Amino acid sequence: VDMSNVVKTYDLQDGSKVHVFKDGKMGMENKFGKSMNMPEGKVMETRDGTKIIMKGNEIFRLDEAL
Numbered sequence: 001v002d003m004s005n006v007v008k009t010y011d012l013q014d015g016s017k018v019h020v021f022k023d024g025k026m027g028m029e030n031k032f033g034k035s036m037n038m039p040e041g042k043v044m045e046t047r048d049g050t051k052i053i054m055k056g057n058e059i060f061r062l063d064e065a066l
């Protein structure tokens with residue numbers, strides 16, 4: 001992964017990673033570095049307990065206010 005152009009990574013509980021790039025592209029790799037299609041509309045939990053959903057090429061994160 002070209003981490004110098006990655007602005008945010010989400011480290012998922014299952015060891016996969018979602019990477020969001022400076023130009024707005026997004027990709028995913030499993031724990032072995034194999035590319036994955038991103039599951040749109042699926043709740044995914046991060047290692048620190050955050051939950052996210054990807055929809056319309058955007059990341060939505062559990063509202064910390066609640």
Ligand SMILES: [Cu+]
Nearest residue numbers: 026027038054
């Ligand atoms: Cu995505």
